[PDB]
Each structure stands twice: as C-alpha cells, then as structure tokens.
C-alpha cells in the first residue's frame, strides 16, 4: 500500500490548543507577534499571579496529575505506558533544574541538577500546627504548571489548614517557593525549611550558606538560603534550618517566600536575583513571582520564531518544541571546561550529555533562535571537546554517536546569523580538523573511532559503532565493515560546509583544499555507492565490495545533504521506495526499510523517534525540492503534509493535545492486536499497521521524558515557509506547498541582521494584508508573489527570479530594505552575548 493514501492522525484533547481565544492580538507580519502578544498580556496583568498567564504559559499549561495512560482514537480507548503524570518540574534556570521531582511535597523535592544531578533535594518544608508536623495532601486536581512556574494546593486531611504553593526557578538559578498559608482557626503555624545545599549559619542569623562541587567538579556553587514573612521580616536560622511561626487569624491567609540561590561566581546575576529576594525589592512573594515569570516569557519574544498554520495541533507542538530546545539546554558559563558555552543537551531529564550525532540535529532548530549564541555555542562546544587523533587531527566526540554533521549544521547556523571572518574561519578549522581526523581515523586505536579502515574517501563502520540499521543484519555479515552512504554523506556535508566557511572567511587556500576533499568523497560516493544494477544508493561491504542488500533511510543521506548531483535520471529513481508504506512508512516513521526488516524476520528494535522523523523529513524535503520526488509521485506534497501531521500527533500522550511529551522513543510493541494484515501471524507489522489506523496511537512512550532526539520545527521555517539560508545577501524561498493550507506565517526570524517574516494568505482574507506569498525584511514588505513558488530575491537589485515553472507574478515592496547583509558582513558588538563566546570588544 502507498504512503500517499495512508490515514491521517486524529488529534484529541482541547478545542483550542493554541489558546487563540486567550490572545486578541491582530497579526501584523511587519512586527514581532510575540512582542505585540507580550505587550497585550502585560496590559491584561500577565504575571501578577497564577490566574494571569502570558500566552506561551497558557499554551504549555499542564493541569492535574494527568495524563495516566488512558487515551482514545476515533475507534475507542487504548492504554499506553509512559504517561508523565505531570510529575516533572518544567520551571528551571539556565543551569538548575529538577532531574527528578516529587510534586506532592512542598519546596523542591527530588534530584536537583546544577548542570547534572546532585542527588540532593533543593529544600523541604515542614508545617507544624497544633504542636504536630502536619501531612499536607496535594489536591492534584489543583496542580497547574507552565514553563515559568508550578502551583498546587496542599491541605491537611481535616482541611483546617491549606497552603497554595507557587514555585519557580529564576533565570540565574534561584529556587523560590511562595507559600500562601490559611487556617480555619486562629493558629500559630511553625514553618521549617532545610536545604541539603546550604546548612551553615549561626542560630539567630537570617541566611544559611554552603559550597557544593557539581558533578565532575566542573564548578563550585555557593548556595545561599533565606525566607521572609508577608511583612518582610526574615526567617531565623535554627539548627541549620530556617524557621518562622505565623500568627494566623482564622480564614486570613499569610504568604511567605523561601529562596535558595544556587550561586556561581561565573553567573553574577545568580547573586543579584537571590539578594533581590532575600533583602531587596523582590522580597514580596508577588513581586518575586512577577519578575521571574515576566523574565521567563521575555525570552520567547527575544528568541523564538512565531509559527502559525491552519492546524493548531501542529502549531502547539511547534511551541512545545521551541520549549524542548530551550529546556534541553545548558547555559552555565563555566570557566575552563566546555560548558563555558550555551549548549544543546540530549535530554536533561535522561542521559543529560552532549552527543555529537544529536548536537548537529538540534542546531537545525536552534539556528532559528533569534540570538546566535543558542546554536554557535553548540558547535563551539563540539570544537572545544574534539578528540585528538593519533594522526594529529581533532574530531568531534561525545562529551558524556556513530556520526555527526556538526560542521554542516554550524555552517547552516552561520548562513542564518553570520559573523566576521574569525567566526567563519573557526567553524572551518574545527570542520577541517574533524573531516581530516575521520579520513585518517584508521590510526585510531579504539575500533569505534576508526571510521575509515580501508583508507579511502568513504566512512566505514561495523555495527559496534551503533540505530535500526537493518543493513548490518545481512546474513553472513556479522561484525563486517561497510563504506556507508550516511557516514560518507555527513563527512561530505562537513567538508563541503568547511569549504564554504573557509571561502566566507576569505581563506581561499583552505577553501580549495577542503573543496578537493569534498570533491573526492562525492566522486567516491557516486562511483562506489551507486548500484547501477537497481538504481539505488547502497552501502558497500569492505571485504568483497558487495552492495549491502538491506536498506534504511540512511541510504539516502547523500540526497538529504545535497551530495548527489541533481538532474540525474538514474539518481532520482532511487527515491521510488518512499512511494510504499511497505518500504518506508510515514507512521510509524522508521529508519529501517520495513520490507527488508520483514525479509530478515525482524532483527533489531521496533522503536521510532523524532531521531527517525528528522532525517525522514530531510530526505522528503531534499527529495521534493531537488530530486523530483513529487514530480515522480515518489514523495508527494500530500505525503509530506501527512508526515508533519503524524510527527505532531506522536508528541501527544494518548493523542491528547493537552499532554505533549517528547519521549526519547516510542513503539507499538505492547499494542495487543490480532492478524491485522491477514498474513497468518501476529508480529510487529500488525501492531504498527493498527497504530496507523483509526486516528493513530502510541502504546509505549519511553522512560526519558520532555527530551529531544532530533527536532523538527525547521520544517515550518524551511519547507512550509520555504526559507533557504544562504551565505549571500539574496533571500531564497523554496516552499513545499502543503495541500489545503490557504494560509500560514513564520514571524520574526532573525536572519542576516534582519527581522524576517513570511506569509501565505491565498486571498488575503485570513490576515487582512496582501493576498499571496509575502516576504517581510526589516519591518517592510520585500515582495508579494500571487502563488507559493521558488523565488530568489536580490534586495540590492530589487529583483525576484522565479526558479520553478510557476507563472508566479511577483511585486517588490515600494519600501523594500535594499541593504541586506551577506552572512560574512555581520559583526558582533559588546552587547551581543555571542561576542563573549569568541572573546567589551566587538567581533569584526
Ligand atoms: Ca494556527
Ligand atoms: Ca572507507
Ligand atoms: Ca499479520
């Protein structure tokens, strides 16, 4: 059966997952929608309390101890494993978060992380009334959390005593708990708080302190711990704890505030945010809350693109994924070691490490954050942690991956944000070091670091360097090496990117040397990995030179990366396999060719993940845009659309848009079904086919939650809106038209020192502006096209070239900004954080 005719998912949950009725802001594509939203939110008292939310907090609101593993599709209820139960704590600072969390205990109970797990609670609160320490039961139906705070209601069994907790971690790692205490009777209530982080201080003091070496002694923190009563008096130290007795009048609440500053010398605002709350102007619970939540939400305005499609279920997953990219990051500014840079992390609630395979994948989205430090820091961190090879090169290496495209992803980031020659040259140099290290890696003593054991211009691996790579399951080939299409595409992509970065820097000699290396790898991929017998790109076994008979989407990375020449009839036929769900299904979105997996009686896992969806989307994108896949009917616009819908659907626990959670992976292994395909047997084909029917389901969600393992928001910016980053001053749009979508917008990209927005509004009726496909640069209309088309705009010349066979009618805006920089004309100044990554100086 064909992919073009598989069913769509059916989203469940809220009617208004983008909370459209909570945001009255009219869209003007010439300005930041999130800025205007924020302005209207503040006018409406956003941040004054937990009943007045900023829009992004409303969207990503999680209420209750929900969900619990009960979902529904169009046919009926299904059980699933791996509900998160709204038990993790979202609120976190740039370095501090809860690795584990006990939501039904006051304070911050669970494994506190400062970069990584400390095995310590942040702080606990004991409530003593009537002479007794009280059990405060959470009413979990009142549990509410957002990216910026957590709140719940705690009550004694007899309901004589209630505490509304509001807790939040500030940007610079102050862990704060507001407790609103109410008694039905006049009472003296003694609160005691204790922190494993800070227990040093004289009885009668108003602060406790400590010093804690973090995991792997990467730094030392100097925690300070204090609290105040509603009248601003401080809690007093007693026995290495803080204590206060409230004189409660019946039915009269009093609000206290506890703060633990996880203070680092290298983060001076950690001290400032703490001191403001200890004795400064943020002592009051309400002011402390409004400052933290406002600051949290300002980051979205400043960093996140705004994406709007006709499918608000996808839009909410896009907001959730900007949050995944922000939440799964470390910005600790640690001196010496690599965490001196803002870096993407592969699952802060999981393995919590920098994995080179996924680092390059994450930067496909983080490059779209408006500030370049949130992508540059990731590739600088890879360059700083690179492993010295026996041959004298430095190659990217996990800082606890069979492969990586960090240099290409870094180059993509530079094509978005730019920078001077020293930035371009640094990326090229770490890139060239890595490519050369891999080419020469036959000299690596660890066999898994040896990626070129026949010493040619192709990457080779054995299955020990790993991924669902069914190619390695070929009978008779256990432990054998093959020259890899994927490894070779990624090394080519790095080499090609390094050549481009050398050129952008002005380093002609190194640009030509890397171009020569790229040209050789490309020639060897097209000559050695092209199976002319069946017009497929295949891995090649080192021992006999035989093509690997079994296939995965990894076979197509030479297309994904643009290694393969275009306009080659034979090369373009390789993508025919994407026609068939039997070969490469849309959902579940597997890496392994499923016909191949079946031919071998199902070796490996039945798992699927965003790590499979991202490269599948990359193949679909390159396939459609460059290798004629939609013209051939191999990968149609409708199929691309269906994959976006399935990818969004997978994010939702039980298909319910209230409960987004990107697990490390999914499967249907526990999907209790019969012979659904009618082949005589109950195997994984049955579980997987059933899961794609009746609106979809995922019966197993893995134990690592709110993680990233690949990422997909780039599809909205680059395929739907069509943005093609370039080194030069020209803006290229190459949209993949989504059938039935009469509007969309990507708002407030930061691209070559310009605000950029893209609008599709078929007849202008949705946004009330120009009809058609419009680009905004610098707050002015650049151009409007009557249709979605492949357009290259030269702002310096005021020309738009129509590159496709559309008869697209384009008009250039009367006030178009002409002076759009090329990437290598962007400079950084002392007021850009990115300057501190490389250096009050400028980077020119
Ligand atoms: Ca929408
Ligand atoms: Ca090789
Ligand atoms: Ca069957």
Q: How far apart are CA 792 and CA 207, in angstroms?
A: 62
Decide if 663 is inside a domain: no
Whole-angstrom CA distances from 198 to 260, 435, 737 are: 8, 47, 57
Domain stops at, among 301, 332, 366 = 301
Do 433 and 560 belong together in one domain? yes
Give the ligand at the shortest distance from the Cα of 441. Answer: 2
Reduce the secondary structure of 293-321 to three states and give it as a string: HHHHHHHHHHHCCEEECCCHHHHHHHHHH
| Ligand 2 mean position, distance from CA 458 (Å) | 4
Instruction: Please tell me the distance between residue 679's alpha carbon and the centre of ligand 3 in angstroms.
Output: 5
**Secondary structure class of 110 (helix, strand, coil):** coil
Same structural domain for residues 272 and 130? yes
CATH of the domain at 191: 2.70.98
CA of 435 to the centre of ligand 2 (A): 13
Task: Give the side-chain half-sphere CA count within 13 A for 67.
Answer: 23
Q: How many domains are contained in the chain?
A: 3
> Distance, CA 485 to ligand 2 centroid (Å)?
11
Cα gap 687→602, rounded to integer Å:
13
Strand 780-785 vs strand 791-794: parallel, antiparallel, or unpaired?
unpaired
Residue 25 located in a structural domain? no
One domain, residues 171 and 278: yes
What distance in Å separates the CA atoms of residue 363 and residue 99, rounded to the nearest whole number?
Answer: 23
Experimental method: X-ray
Query: Does residue 296 sit in the same domain as residue 400?
Result: no
237 in the same domain as 110: yes
Ion ligand 1 nearby residues (CB, 5 A): 308, 312, 315
Q: Which residues of 500-538 are buried (b: 16+ CB within 10 A; e: fewer)?
A: bbbbbbebeebbebbbebbebbbebbbebbbbeeeebbb
In a domain, residue 692? The reply is no
DSSP symbol at 565:
P
Q: Is residue 194 part of a domain?
A: yes
At CA 281, angle to CA 275 and CA 285, rounded to 5? 90
Domain termination residue (choose one: 542, 564, 586): 564
Which of 267, 301, 335 is the last residue in one of the domains? Answer: 301
Does any domain span residue 466?
A: yes
List C-alpha distances in Å: 720 to 327, 588, 741, 809. 25, 22, 10, 20
Do 242 and 233 form a contact (C-beta atoms < 8 A)? no
Q: Which residues contact 758 (CB under 8 A, 6 or more apart)?
A: 721, 722, 723, 733, 745, 746, 749, 773, 774, 775, 776
* Distance from the Cα of residue 12 to its chain's centroid: 23
Structural domain contains residue 627? no
Give the Cα separation of 82 and 74 in Å (integer). 21
In a domain, residue 271? The reply is: yes
Residues with CB under 5 A from ligand 3 (ion): 675, 677, 679, 681, 686
Tokens of 464: 């020990």
Range of the domain at 447: 387-564
Residue 721 and residue 785 in contact, taking contact as beta carbons nearer than 8 Å: no
Smallest Cα–Cα separation from 258: which of 200, 174, 201?
174
* 3-state helix vs strand vs coil in the chain, percent to 5: 30, 25, 45
- Ligand 1 centroid to Cα of residue 750, in Å, is 21
Statement to judge: residues 110 and 239 lie in one domain: yes
**Token pair listed for 107:** 């304070």
Same structural domain, 109 and 214: yes
- Alpha helices for 28-161 (secondary structure H): 33-43, 55-59
Ligand 2: distance of its center to the CA of 523 in Å? 13
Which one of the ligands is nearest to 316 CA? 1
Buried (b) or exposed (e) across 350-375, using 16+ Cβ within 10 A? bebebbbbbbbbbbbbbbbbbbbbbb
3-state per-residue secondary structure call for 74-95: CCCEEECECCCCCCCCCCCCCC
- Compute, in angstroms, the gap from residue 455 CA to the centroid of ligand 2: 5
Residue 282 and residue 397 in one domain:
no
Report the C-alpha gap between 335 and 691 in whole angstroms: 49
DSSP assignment letter at 115 = S
């Amino acid at each position: 059966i064909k992919n073009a005719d598989v069913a769509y998912p059916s989203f469940k949950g809220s009617d208004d997952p983008m909370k459209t009725a909570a945001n009255n802001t009219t869209y003007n594509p010439a300005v930041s929608y999130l800025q205007e939203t924020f302005d209207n939110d503040v006018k409406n008292l956003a941040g004054i309390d937990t009943d007045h939310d900023f829009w992004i907090d409303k969207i990503l609101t999680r209420t209750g101890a929900q969900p619990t593993g009960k979902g529904t599709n169009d046919k009926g209820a299904y059980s699933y494993e791996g509900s998160d139960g709204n038990n993790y704590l979202f609120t976190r600072g740039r370095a501090a978060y809860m690795y584990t969390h006990t939501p039904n205990q006051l304070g911050f109970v669970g494994d506190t992380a400062y970069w990584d797990q400390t095995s310590r609670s942040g702080f606990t609160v004991t409530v003593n009334a009537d002479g007794s320490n009280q059990t405060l039961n959470e009413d979990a139906s009142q549990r509410k959390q957002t990216p910026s705070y957590f709140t719940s209601l705690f009550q004694t069994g007899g309901k004589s005593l209630k505490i509304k907790e509001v807790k939040y971690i500030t940007y610079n790692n102050v862990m704060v708990a507001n407790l609103t205490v109410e008694s039905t009777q006049d009472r003296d209530v003694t609160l005691t708080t204790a922190s494993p982080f800070a227990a040093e201080g004289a009885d009668g003091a108003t602060e406790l302190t400590g010093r804690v070496n973090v995991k792997n002694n990467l730094t030392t923190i100097y925690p300070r711990f204090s609290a105040n009563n509603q009248d601003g008096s401080n809690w007093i130290v007693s026995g290495g704890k803080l204590t206060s007795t409230l004189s409660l009048k019946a039915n009269e609440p009093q609000t206290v505030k506890i703060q633990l500053g996880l203070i680092a010398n290298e983060l001076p605002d950690s001290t400032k945010e703490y001191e403001a709350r200890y004795t400064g102007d943020l002592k009051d619970a309400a002011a402390s809350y409004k400052d933290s939540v406002t600051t949290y939400n300002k980051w979205w305005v400043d960093n996140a693109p705004y994406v709007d499609t006709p499918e608000d279920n996808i839009d909410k997953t896009v907001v959730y994924r900007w949050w995944l990219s922000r939440f799964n990051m470390l910005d600790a500014n640690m001196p010496g070691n690599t965490f001196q840079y803002p870096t993407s992390i592969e699952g802060v609630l999981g393995y919590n490490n920098q994995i080179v395979l996924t680092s390059g994948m994450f930067m496909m989205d983080t490059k779209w954050f408006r500030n370049p430090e949130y992508s540059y820091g990731t590739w600088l961190s890879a360059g700083d942690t690179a492993k010295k090879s026996k041959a004298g090169y430095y190659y990217y290496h996990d800082n606890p991956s069979y492969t990586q495209y960090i240099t290409r992803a870094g180059w993509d980031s530079y094509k978005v944000h730019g920078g001077p020659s020293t930035v371009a040259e640094e990326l090229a140099d770490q890139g060239a070091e890595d490519v050369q290290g891999l080419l020469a890696s036959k000299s690596e003593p660890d066999n898994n670091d040896n990626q070129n054991n026949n010493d040619n211009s192709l990457i080779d691996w054995s299955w020990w360097s790993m991924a669902d790579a069914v190619s390695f399951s070929e009978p008779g080939r256990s432990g054998q090496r093959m020259d890899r299409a994927d490894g070779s595409a990624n090394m080519w992509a790095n080499a090609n990117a390094a050549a481009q970065a050398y050129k952008a820097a002005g380093d002609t000699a190194n640009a030509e040397k890397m171009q020569a290396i790229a040209d050789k790898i490309q020639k060897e991929v097209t000559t050695e990995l092209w199976d002319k017998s069946d017009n497929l790109l295949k891995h090649k076994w080192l021992n006999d030179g035989a093509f690997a008979k079994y296939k995965e989407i990894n076979n197509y990375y030479p297309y994904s990366e643009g290694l393969m020449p275009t306009g080659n009839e034979d090369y373009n036929k390789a993508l025919r396999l994407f026609e068939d769900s039997n070969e490469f299904p849309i959902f579940p979105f597997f890496t392994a060719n499923q016909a191949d997996k079946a031919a071998l009686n199902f070796p490996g896992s039945n798992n699927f993940s965003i790590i499979n969806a991202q490269p599948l989307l990359q193949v679909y994108s390159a396939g459609i845009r460059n290798y004629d896949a939609a013209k051939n009917g191999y990968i149609t616009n409708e199929q691309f659309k269906k994959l976006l819908y399935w990818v969004a659907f997978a994010h939702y626990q039980g298909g319910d848009n209230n409960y987004p959670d990107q697990n490390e992976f999914w499967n249907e292994d526990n999907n209790n079904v019969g012979d659904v395909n009618g082949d005589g047997v109950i195997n994984n084909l049955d579980k997987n086919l059933d899961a794609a029917q009746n609106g979809g389901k995922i019966t197993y969600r893995s134990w690592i939650h709110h993680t990233q393992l690949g990422t997909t928001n780039w599809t909205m910016v680059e395929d739907v809106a069509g943005m093609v980053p370039r080194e030069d001053n020209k803006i290229e749009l190459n949209p993949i038209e989504i059938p039935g979508w009469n509007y969309f917008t990507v708002n407030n990209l930061r691209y070559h020192d310009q605000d950029v927005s893209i609008v599709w509004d078929k007849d202008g009726s949705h946004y009330g502006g120009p009809a058609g496909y419009s680009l905004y640069v610098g707050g002015k209309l650049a151009f409007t096209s009557d249709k979605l088309a492949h357009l290259i705009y030269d702002p310096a010349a005021g020309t738009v070239e129509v590159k496709d066979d559309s008869s697209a009618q384009v008009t250039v805006g009367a006030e178009a900004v002409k002076n759009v920089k090329a990437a290598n004309q962007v400079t950084f100044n002392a007021d850009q954080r990115v300057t501190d990554l490389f250096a009050t100086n400028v980077l020119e």
